[PDB]
Symmetry: C3
Subunit: 498 residues, 3 copies
């Protein structure tokens, strides 16, 4: 690959945030590898945040995002156009705000929260809340909130309008000199973005889709060296609909495409739309051959390719754990079936008592598990430890780990554990686990409903230190041979070259 290649990759997803994992981790690391191979791979997002600067800076400070990865955001782009049209700050905006606050007395609620009342009439005028570098000002009309101005570092970046139910129905974004550059309608019911007005260019759009199609045609040169990769399934139409004639388009599916918990044969509606149009773009990528194989029968398309996530080999713990500890790391999600896990930890501890179960995670499964834990009185064995910033020093504490998930794209959490020499006991589900857990040499695969069979193989190893240690080391080394950076990279480059 030409160190001076003019190839560039644009990887698309709705938003980035701190403490948001999932495919964005896969995007971050994938960007890192492309740059290492001298192909810049940046990220494109389509949502509004007044503090994206702080968010990206923090993602890089925490080592989650490679320093070379840029994020291109649609509102930032028009903000930058607006910044270069005015050469004088919008004082009138501040005057407008200041005028509405004159003739008021202040009544404090607490140190950064006060209300303001007209001193002639006693009418409720404003609510002001201040925290650190942020400030919100809420204006009232007939004692109902109508507007909120949001500030960062004493500069307005956003104004919101509220309807009779006190929900947002309109937004304005201001540039760094105080000028409005975009406004847009919000449907108060569901929060869907509607008509979008690009004020700085005197142009209207039907909605954010139309806005971003336009943005991408400005952002991404129409050359065969421009590569677009859409990871966010919700964002695929933005890519699909541009008028690029020469730039390449790929869509990546990160999850099982079958609808969750269905016997109809139902496919998730977005991922089905992406798959069905595979022959209208350069390619749809899935993480396993298993999934690629299922698709080629099910659908009449051919442009389906298998490319695994890159895998990064962190250093293993210095010490094998031997205390009968076994943990679970995950978001608290229905599809990871932690409900079965507690019903196996129930089983393990009726038979062997000194085993305990450490659970890290946050989500819609936590407080109906906590209640599930002591309904059957098990919280001196089963522990629910909340969120994990450092889920590698949690791996060191574990002898083995468990996965009761029914639906995965690849199961990276299971791979990541094997890297720390911590062997895995998990369901034989699609897709992922069947590949990198070799039954009886680095961890166990069970067939997916037999939580009883899970009892045996789990407490087997929680009292066999040497088979615990040897399998984890066979689990780490297996990963290294199976998922090499150079192998993945090559599959990418063959697609781009055509």
């Amino acid at each position: 690959i030409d160190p001076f290649t003019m190839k560039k990759i644009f990887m698309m997803v709705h938003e980035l945030d701190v403490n948001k994992g999932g495919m964005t981790s896969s995007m971050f690391n994938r960007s890192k590898e492309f740059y290492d191979a001298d192909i810049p791979a940046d990220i494109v997002t389509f949502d509004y945040k007044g503090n994206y600067d702080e968010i990206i800076k923090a993602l890089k400070k925490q080592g989650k995002m490679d320093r070379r990865t840029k994020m291109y955001n649609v509102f930032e782009y028009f903000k930058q156009i607006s910044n270069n049209k005015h050469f004088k700050s919008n004082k009138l905006l501040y005057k407008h705000i200041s005028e509405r606050l004159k003739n008021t007395i202040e009544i404090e609620e607490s140190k950064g929260i006060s209300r303001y009342f007209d001193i002639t009439t006693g009418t409720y005028i404003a609510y002001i809340r201040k925290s650190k570098s942020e400030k919100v000002i809420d204006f009232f009309k007939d004692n109902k909130r109508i507007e909120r101005f949001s500030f960062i570092d004493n500069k307005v970046h956003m104004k919101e309008t509220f309807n009779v139910d006190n929900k947002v129905c309109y937004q304005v974004f201001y540039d760094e000199k105080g000028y409005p550059y975009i406004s847009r309608n919000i449907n108060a019911n569901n929060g869907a973005v509607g008509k979008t007005y690009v004020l700085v260019n005197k142009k209207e759009f039907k909605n954010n889709l139309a806005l971003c199609v336009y943005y991408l045609e400005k952002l991404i040169k129409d050359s065969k060296d421009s590569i677009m990769i859409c990871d966010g399934p919700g964002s695929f139409p933005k890519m699909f609909n541009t008028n690029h004639k020469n730039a390449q388009k790929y869509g990546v599916i990160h999850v099982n495409h079958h609808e969750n918990f269905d016997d109809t044969g139902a496919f998730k509606k977005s991922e089905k739309y992406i798959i069905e149009n595979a022959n209208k773009i350069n390619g749809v990528i899935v993480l396993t051959e298993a999934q690629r194989l299922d698709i080629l029968n099910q659908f009449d398309v051919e442009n389906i390719f298998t490319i695994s996530n890159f895998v990064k080999i962190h250093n293993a713990p210095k010490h094998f754990q031997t205390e009968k500890i076994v943990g679970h790391i995950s978001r608290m999600v229905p599809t990871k079936r932690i409900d079965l896990l507690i019903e196996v930890a129930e089983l393990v501890v009726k038979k062997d008592n000194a085993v305990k179960f450490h659970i890290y995670g946050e989500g819609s499964v936590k407080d109906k598990i906590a209640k599930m834990i002591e309904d059957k009185n098990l919280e001196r064995n089963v522990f629910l430890k909340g969120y994990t910033t450092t889920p590698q020093k949690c791996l060191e504490d574990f002898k083995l780990v468990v996965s009761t998930s029914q639906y995965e794209g690849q199961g990276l959490s299971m791979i990541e554990a094997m890297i720390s020499k911590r062997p895995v006991v998990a369901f034989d589900i699609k897709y992922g686990p069947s590949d990198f857990i070799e039954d009886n040499k680095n961890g166990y695969l069970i067939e997916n409903h037999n939580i009883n069979d899970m009892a045996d193989k789990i407490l087997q190893l929680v009292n066999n230190d040497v088979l615990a240690a040897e399998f984890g080391s066979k689990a780490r080394e297996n990963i290294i041979e199976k998922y090499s950076t150079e192998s993945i990279l090559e599959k990418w480059l063959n697609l781009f070259n055509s």
Copy 2:
């Protein structure tokens, strides 16, 4: 009749419009005949239209309204009072509008539709739509429409106010120099007019009824030579409630007074109110003796008189049609039972295929007929040709015509067809057809449910050219002897003279 008579007739109805037929046609022609006999007969209306000038001009251009017939409208009257109180245009109104639009940028939607956004705050200010000589300006508040200004020739004539559901709850009417002369409350639910404020006279009224009672006492001199004729049943209370001591009052009923599709013996509520008060005014007029007869038993009143509509004899077609074509002209209305018609055209064409059925009309029966047409697969026989501006050159194309109506006042469409020498096959219903279709000499009457008996007599004549031609000529000439202008006029004059 004195060519210098001071008699004048005021004929009342809610509104006039282009493409609105029915009794207004009867009013138009009736006015024409009264003027010919040297008695002016003008029309009074009670609704608001900013473009009534254009509407009346067009009605006269199209030859629907006699050039001598004036329309007196209640809002026009107060508009004219306001016009003579101010001698300087209302610049402040335009300044008010212009002020709210300053400091905006424009964002086009299409060539005559743009939106306006405050350039300091980005707030949505206005929507402007322009077409030819008309313009509407919509102002927004918290991103919801609150007001609409309507323009004709760049002059405001109306302002409307909108509630939270974006429905009108208040209206203002402006005179030709821009001054508000009337405002009024609207009930957003049903559109009923409420409190009405006559600003130019500093006076309030309970509602449009009270307003128009007042108007009529100003418009119509209280002399025995002032004659009021109420045609619009909805407008009867306006007439009934004035304090005129000397002016004559008549009400005309144009329809069957029995409630439609009823077995109770139910009378339409308005027409019952008019009938019950017949002995409290000079007279209630119905179009047939049949109907007059039914009333005199049913009710304890005597002032019921029969006077037919005037009938105008247009020139007949030069040629008899002989192609097996037979048509239906009507609004698409439940009471004209076109449902039976298609179920007779079904019958005719199972027996004789080369017959086809041309249907002109628009209404609430059209798209459940179109579907009814091909559910039984008949659209190469039965044709639905939309609206008719020239329903006489449609008469020429026909050999005969059909009426499946169950409820009529007289059945003028059936008479009008006979004039074009096109004989009629229609139900023997009340009221009208029993009079001017002589069974077996100019057309057929069937008894009203036997659509099978209709099959026989219809396709009889669609293949008997000479009985088709002779009956139509017997149908035209019959009309001429039966309904003469001089005969009708005389019945009117005897009422007025008493």
Copy 3:
């Protein structure tokens, strides 16, 4: 008692009003007796009225309130603080109002009611209603009322804000120079007072409870000579929650504490809260030993004391009535079971016809009694005479009187009648009647469901003039011996001294 004692009693209740009886009568007279014994006893209220001055003046003019009794009201207090901070009238408030009314025409509705419309646009601006010394101005926005300014003697005292449903959601109170001193949120659904802003002191409160707790700590010196008596059960938390360490606190229960019409054993929720905290204050007072006795078992507290209302002996009528008249005085309330009364007056008059039944009262039982009266056709015997300002000259007209009440605190109306030498026939209910009607010496007690037994003893006396006269005189004198001022007063003083 020291004529120079620094003892003072503060008696608490939500509001005072004219034509509002009940415990406020008991408070009025109780105040009178304390002052006579040289201990000032004033009243504290917690609601807003712009005309409290007129109301108190009228209560004293009518001899209902002792001239020495002051009323301390929470809003008056802050009004007075505001009055002493400004030394210039708030002209801007009047300018604000005047500005919104300029450029309008007036349209009269009647002599004190007019509407105002902008003369440039015709928009509805205001509604003004004037009566005597009061005026309200309503302002409109998009033809919906948003604000009402209330005036007394041409000075604003209140401004109200209206929501989309035209209900109050915010109030402002202005001082006598026109300055806003308090504003507060109203929940439009139920009318509950919320966040309260004491503008004159730049301070906020959670609600009226928090406001009044604060008020009472300012109003009532924290000394053992400050005595707080809470009569209004709704107002007990205001007293209970102050931080007074030294001032005494008593709560008085005026009614049966059992929930009305219940078989569960349910206690009225407020009175239960007061009773349960009896040992946390100086004492809970009930009107009878009977009720005190029921409580000491039912609850685990001891600070329950019995002290009767003071009783005032008005002069008796000069003449015994002997016409068979027998009356009922009461508010028309479910708990006084006038339904049974009419079903005894039914019984009395089937047997003796010349007896009639005079009923004075107003309430939620009147119009389902009127209908109940002639459904059984009895209004030439049973009479419903409306409200009574002079219920002593109604006592003179009566030979005896009746009470069918199931629930009482003491039954003062029954006592008051005996004073006029009018003996009572009433149910033996709790609490009260068992004490001061001695069965067979001054009136009759029946057991509470036997309305038939009531027939006998009633018409017995309506035809025994001498037993009617003698029992009433035994009824008057009994009261005098039983309920002496000095006896009551002494029970109070022993509590205060401890």
